[PDB]
Write a protein that binds this ligand. Structure first.
Ligand SMILES: N=C(NO)c1ccc(C(F)(F)F)cc1
Ligand SMILES: N=C(NO)c1ccc(C(F)(F)F)cc1
Lengths: 237, 300
């Protein structure tokens, strides 16, 4: 059934599973026309498909050409997502295929179920958690590769960098969701926290800065304060 | 005009014949039903006074043989049986008719209700849904489950309705996932009408049979099948124009006949709101939409 706080540790067991977030698949800028009407212009998007145990991220870049001449794009985007996730599963060797796929938005359930009919043993699950994966395009290297794409492209990352050498996947996922929640709630302030010391460098082959264990404690503390503050600046408390 | 004689009435029972019904008291001198119109299937059904559990009954066509009802004290129900001795049947019925021990099928002459509810229903096809080949008549009751229900447990006692499942490989062409899920025309027209049913008359007949079992027996699996067959048509953008017009008439008479006090359990809110107000055919069921709005505006 649905994934929630009560069954949270299931994410880090040894059954392969993927989260699928479609938030950033169909992305537009809304603008005025010469006649004073409003129009949209699409920009490149991405499917965020993530193994929470290993950190492996399958970033399918959605090039704006896929929308050309199509109607009801917000609806199409859910079915395009499901098409691409199904294609990804079919491309994986059997022993790498997931046993569950957890969609972050319930509106993905039927499109994914229909595209995965050939995989009756793969469970398609919703979640009650409010996961911050929409903020993935606040990660500079992810944003960069999406915007530069000139054609459909899949790019593979490990969203945990090398963290699993030193911490467990429960702790790594907690760190990731904290970073992404902060970026979602106040992007400028979160980026200041991560990047105001240029000597703590991002390795060429990484996404996040090369913080020591003690620096990660300080960073994580700063992210919590930002989230609680914004919750303050928001509701006035 | 044919006759379904009754050996006796040893237990108090409400007896239905099509849309009519009457109460018979324990050991009341009742010996059956006469003047049954020829040319239609019929259903004769029972609800015992003491145990309203299990409505049950028999679908039959008097053209196919001489049928009668005799109560079985061992199995505790009124059973239909076929009398193969035509002379014995004529003579026993003649005595019963002469003593005026039979009720008369009380058909008003203006009234086409039963024709309209059974227009496409045939016993030969009904026997395919209810498999008991040694009999010419078919038993149904409140509890029998459908093949599709069993898949999700006695197969001999199941309602073999056509399995409709919108999230199934049968319903969804590989490569046309979104197209086929959002517009079910290829599932309706190619898979079901051309492939399985063979024509719309067969589609309408099973749909009508599914409704009548839901209404008369409270058979939940039949209600599921009725709604699924409606939803499959309404969710198709491409439906032959004669089919839509006929569906509107079919549904109008079903809604007209439904007991007002059973609408809460026999009508699925989601299907009807989707069919009448959201679907491709939202504008094609004028008679059905008008009676639903004047009779059940709450459901909507
Ligand atoms: N007990 C019976 N046979 O042994 C029997 C009783 C009544 C009928 C009827 F004519 F009404 F159909 C047929 C048979
Ligand atoms: N051709 C059919 N498809 O199964 C079919 C046609 C008519 C009935 C009926 F309910 F009227 F008996 C049942 C089935």
């Amino acid at each position: 059934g649905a994934m929630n706080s009560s069954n949270y540790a299931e994410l880090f067991n040894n059954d392969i599973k993927l989260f699928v977030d479609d938030t950033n698949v169909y992305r537009v800028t809304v603008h005025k026309t010469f006649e004073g009407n409003v129009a949209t212009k699409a920009i490149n998007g991405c499917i965020f498909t993530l193994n929470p145990k290993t950190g492996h991220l399958f970033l399918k870049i959605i090039h704006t050409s896929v929308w050309a001449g199509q109607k009801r794009l917000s609806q199409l985007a859910k079915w395009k997502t499901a098409e691409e996730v199904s294609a990804l599963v079919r491309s994986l060797p059997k022993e790498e295929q997931p046993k569950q796929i957890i969609v972050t938005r319930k509106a993905m359930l039927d499109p994914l179920e229909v595209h995965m009919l050939d995989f009756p043993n793969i469970a398609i699950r919703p979640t009650e958690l409010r996961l911050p994966f929409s903020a993935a395009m606040s990660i500079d290297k992810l944003s960069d590769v999406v915007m530069k794409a000139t054609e459909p492209q899949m790019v593979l990352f490990n969203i945990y960098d090398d963290w699993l050498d030193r911490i467990s996947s429960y702790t790594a996922f907690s760190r990731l969701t904290l970073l992404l929640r902060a970026l979602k709630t106040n992007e400028e302030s979160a980026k200041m926290i991560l990047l105001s010391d240029p000597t703590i460098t991002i390795k060429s082959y990484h996404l996040w800065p090369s913080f020591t264990d003690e620096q990660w404690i300080t960073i994580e503390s700063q992210m919590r304060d930002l989230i609680l503050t914004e919750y303050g600046r928001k509701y006035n408390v | 005009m044919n006759t379904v004689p009754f050996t006796s009435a040893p237990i108090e029972v409400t007896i239905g014949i099509d849309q009519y019904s009457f109460n018979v008291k324990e050991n009341q001198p009742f010996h059956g039903i006469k003047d049954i119109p020829i040319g239609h299937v019929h259903v004769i059904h029972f609800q015992h006074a003491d145990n309203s559990s299990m409505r049950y009954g028999y679908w039959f066509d008097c053209r196919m043989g001489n049928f009668y009802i005799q109560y079985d004290p061992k199995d505790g129900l009124y059973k239909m049986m076929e009398e193969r001795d035509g002379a014995k049947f004529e003579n026993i019925v003649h005595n019963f008719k002469e003593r005026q021990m039979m009720v008369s099928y009380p058909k008003i002459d203006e009234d086409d209700t039963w024709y309209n509810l059974t227009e496409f229903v045939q016993m030969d096809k009904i026997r395919k849904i209810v498999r008991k080949d040694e009999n010419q008549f078919s038993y149904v009751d409140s509890s029998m489950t459908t093949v599709q229900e069993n898949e999700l447990s006695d197969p001999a006692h199941s309602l073999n309705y056509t399995v409709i499942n919108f999230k199934s490989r049968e319903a969804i062409r590989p490569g046309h996932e979104m197209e086929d899920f959002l517009d079910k025309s290829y599932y309706l027209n190619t898979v079901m009408l051309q492939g399985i049913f063979k024509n719309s008359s067969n589609y309408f007949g099973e749909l009508q049979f599914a409704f009548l079992n839901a209404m008369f027996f409270g058979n939940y699996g039949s209600s599921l099948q009725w709604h699924a067959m409606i939803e499959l048509i309404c969710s198709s953008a491409t439906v032959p124009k004669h089919m839509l017009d006929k569906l509107d008439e079919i549904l109008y008479y079903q809604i007209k006949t439904l007991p007002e006090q059973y609408s809460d359990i026999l009508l699925n809110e989601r299907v009807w709101n989707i069919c009448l107000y959201s679907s491709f055919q939202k504008n094609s069921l004028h008679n059905t939409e008008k009676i639903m709005e004047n009779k059940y505006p709450e459901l909507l």
